[PDB]
Design an enzyme around this catalytic site. Structure first.
Site, PDB file in Angstrom:
ATOM      1  N   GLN A   1       0.850  -1.193   0.000  1.00  0.00           N
ATOM      2  CA  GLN A   1       0.000   0.000   0.000  1.00  0.00           C
ATOM      3  C   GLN A   1       0.881   1.237   0.000  1.00  0.00           C
ATOM      4  O   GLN A   1       1.788   1.372   0.833  1.00  0.00           O
ATOM      5  CB  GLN A   1      -0.951   0.049   1.215  1.00  0.00           C
TER       6      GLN A   1
ATOM      7  N   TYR B   1      -6.646  10.266   4.295  1.00  0.00           N
ATOM      8  CA  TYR B   1      -5.278  10.695   3.975  1.00  0.00           C
ATOM      9  C   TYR B   1      -5.287  11.603   2.733  1.00  0.00           C
ATOM     10  O   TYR B   1      -6.346  11.802   2.136  1.00  0.00           O
ATOM     11  CB  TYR B   1      -4.370   9.465   3.837  1.00  0.00           C
TER      12      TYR B   1
HETATM   13  C1  LIG Z   1      -4.361  -1.925  13.551  1.00  0.00           C
HETATM   14  C2  LIG Z   1      -5.013  -1.436  12.384  1.00  0.00           C
HETATM   15  C3  LIG Z   1      -4.281  -0.778  11.443  1.00  0.00           C
HETATM   16  C4  LIG Z   1      -4.846  -0.453  10.213  1.00  0.00           C
HETATM   17  N1  LIG Z   1      -4.032   0.104   9.297  1.00  0.00           N
HETATM   18  C5  LIG Z   1      -4.560   0.439   8.036  1.00  0.00           C
HETATM   19  C6  LIG Z   1      -3.688   1.017   7.021  1.00  0.00           C
HETATM   20  O1  LIG Z   1      -2.452   1.016   7.105  1.00  0.00           O
HETATM   21  N2  LIG Z   1      -4.277   1.390   5.828  1.00  0.00           N
HETATM   22  C7  LIG Z   1      -5.596   1.170   5.558  1.00  0.00           C
HETATM   23  O2  LIG Z   1      -6.092   1.754   4.581  1.00  0.00           O
HETATM   24  N3  LIG Z   1      -6.406   0.550   6.494  1.00  0.00           N
HETATM   25  C8  LIG Z   1      -5.917   0.205   7.708  1.00  0.00           C
HETATM   26  N4  LIG Z   1      -6.750  -0.415   8.662  1.00  0.00           N
HETATM   27  C9  LIG Z   1      -8.197  -0.798   8.299  1.00  0.00           C
HETATM   28  C10 LIG Z   1      -8.296  -2.303   7.803  1.00  0.00           C
HETATM   29  O3  LIG Z   1      -7.765  -2.390   6.521  1.00  0.00           O
HETATM   30  C11 LIG Z   1      -9.767  -2.815   7.763  1.00  0.00           C
HETATM   31  O4  LIG Z   1     -10.485  -2.167   6.684  1.00  0.00           O
HETATM   32  C12 LIG Z   1     -10.470  -2.563   9.093  1.00  0.00           C
HETATM   33  O5  LIG Z   1      -9.763  -3.269  10.131  1.00  0.00           O
HETATM   34  C13 LIG Z   1     -11.971  -2.996   9.101  1.00  0.00           C
HETATM   35  O6  LIG Z   1     -12.077  -4.500   9.049  1.00  0.00           O
HETATM   36  P1  LIG Z   1     -12.143  -5.433  10.354  1.00  0.00           P
HETATM   37  O7  LIG Z   1     -13.508  -5.366  10.902  1.00  0.00           O
HETATM   38  O8  LIG Z   1     -11.894  -6.929   9.703  1.00  0.00           O
HETATM   39  O9  LIG Z   1     -11.007  -5.090  11.219  1.00  0.00           O
HETATM   40  C14 LIG Z   1      -6.237  -0.717   9.945  1.00  0.00           C
HETATM   41  C15 LIG Z   1      -7.024  -1.311  10.955  1.00  0.00           C
HETATM   42  C16 LIG Z   1      -6.432  -1.656  12.186  1.00  0.00           C
HETATM   43  C17 LIG Z   1      -7.256  -2.288  13.253  1.00  0.00           C
END
Ligand SMILES: Cc1cc2nc3c(=O)[nH]c(=O)nc-3n(C[C@H](O)[C@H](O)[C@H](O)COP(=O)(O)O)c2cc1C
Length: 399
Positions: free
Chosen positions: A114, A196
């Site tokens: 990414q 962002y």
């Molecule tokens: C610890 C953490 C870090 C994340 N870092 C990013 C990131 O670097 N870039 C991004 O676009 N999404 C990031 N996300 C969002 C995830 O890609 C995902 O869409 C989000 O966790 C929702 O799904 P879930 O219910 O399976 O956690 C992050 C989420 C968490 C919890």
């Protein structure tokens, strides 16, 4: 321990475990690892953690044919603002990225990097430390209270990018994309979500420009489309995916309160598919679900019912990855994957379960995630979550 009042459901008899070809990659299943920042990268140099990085990813790249989308990575010094997030602009960064890429491949899985650009979400102090700007579409609208407190304390005011600095970020995108491919990545993902920089231009609340970059659905969407068009010429369309968050509110984005929010996103899709017809169809379109409008809200909190992502399917006809509170709703995923070109991104549960796929296939219990180590400089809460076997050996009730 395992999730308490969770009634798992075996998902092996669904399309989630049917192979599918994304870009050049042939996944053995459709449960992908979305991009996840964990803040374990070394400062100075935004070097990927040399002690735990490979292990963490490797544990997640265990089930063959898995597509892994790396943690966001800054395409350049001015694109960043977090000391412990990794970069992809230097040799020292790339050497450690190749090790990573190799281990994932050795386990027969795939990896997309990414490309990250913070805009107003970066800490102004950090940037000001290293003599950098505090960029964004506009300069008369800020992210939040503390963000402006920080900005002024460090005397590093929000700067509205000129057309030449916008071009410079595009240069930085191409190069970062090349070094990611050159290092052996299967492709890159453009982060144009969660508030962002790119999103900051897409969004009417944050973008109050009057030039060719502001003032209309076409102009707001310009910066985003120019990156897609630049990366497609540098590494090819089947190595380029775009991530969007239509209804996201994180980082001060409008969301469903913006009456024109859907029109703004339908426009991006329409142009992506336009190019698709001209032969150039991107590997995918990643989509954060309204189920979760803020990642740091408990599952179930920040759910937007007044809006849906379904409209994209009407415009874009390619593979689409969906991320958002799916782990605890197998009955939802069941319906969702009945569609033939849909992948599910599991985030918070891919942190605690390195063997998530098999647990998903077999309807086996899930490991509770520790919200506290998400962004910790430690191996704990990083590479020490156990697989089902180990949790059983630990006796997380079933000894
Ligand atoms: C610890 C953490 C870090 C994340 N870092 C990013 C990131 O670097 N870039 C991004 O676009 N999404 C990031 N996300 C969002 C995830 O890609 C995902 O869409 C989000 O966790 C929702 O799904 P879930 O219910 O399976 O956690 C992050 C989420 C968490 C919890």
């Amino acid at each position: 321990s395992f999730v308490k009042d969770f009634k798992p459901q075996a998902l092996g008899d669904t399309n989630l475990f049917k192979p599918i070809k994304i870009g050049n990659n042939e996944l053995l299943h459709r449960a992908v690892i979305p991009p996840l920042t964990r803040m374990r990268a070394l400062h100075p140099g935004n070097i990927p953690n040399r002690d735990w990085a490979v292990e963490y990813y490797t544990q997640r790249a265990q089930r063959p044919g898995t597509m892994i989308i790396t943690e966001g990575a800054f395409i350049s010094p001015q694109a960043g603002g977090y000391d412990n997030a990794p970069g992809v602009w230097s040799e020292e960064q790339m050497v450690e990225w190749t090790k990573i890429f190799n281990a994932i491949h050795e386990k027969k899985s795939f990896v997309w990097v990414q490309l990250w650009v913070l805009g107003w979400a970066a800490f102004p102090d950090n940037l000001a430390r290293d003599g950098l700007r505090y960029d964004s579409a506009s300069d008369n609208v800020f992210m939040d209270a503390e963000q402006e407190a920080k900005a002024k304390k460090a005397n590093n005011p929000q700067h509205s990018l000129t057309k030449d600095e916008i071009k410079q970020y595009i240069k930085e995108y191409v190069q970062a994309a090349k070094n990611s491919i050159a290092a052996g990545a299967d492709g890159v993902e453009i982060n144009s979500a969660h508030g962002y920089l790119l999103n900051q231009f897409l969004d009417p609340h944050s973008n109050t420009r009057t030039d060719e970059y502001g003032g209309s659905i076409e102009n707001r969407a310009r910066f985003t489309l120019e990156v897609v068009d630049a990366l497609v010429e540098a590494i090819g369309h089947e190595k380029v995916g775009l991530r969007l968050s239509p209804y996201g509110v994180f980082n001060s984005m409008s969301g469903g309160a913006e009456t024109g929010i859907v029109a703004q996103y339908a426009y991006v899709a329409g142009e992506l598919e336009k190019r698709a017809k001209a032969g150039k169809r991107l590997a995918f379109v990643h989509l954060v679900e309204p189920r979760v409008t803020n990642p740091f809200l408990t599952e179930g909190e920040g759910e937007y019912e007044g809006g849906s992502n379904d409209f994209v399917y009407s415009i874009w006809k390619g593979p689409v990855i969906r991320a958002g509170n799916f782990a605890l709703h197998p009955e939802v995923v069941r319906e969702e994957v009945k569609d033939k070109r849909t992948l599910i991104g599991y985030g918070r549960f891919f942190i605690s379960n390195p063997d998530l796929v098999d647990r998903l296939e077999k309807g086996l219990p899930l490991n509770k995630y520790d919200r506290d180590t998400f962004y910790q400089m430690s191996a704990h809460g990083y590479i020490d979550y156990p697989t089902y076997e180990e949790a059983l050996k630990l006796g997380w009730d079933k000894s």
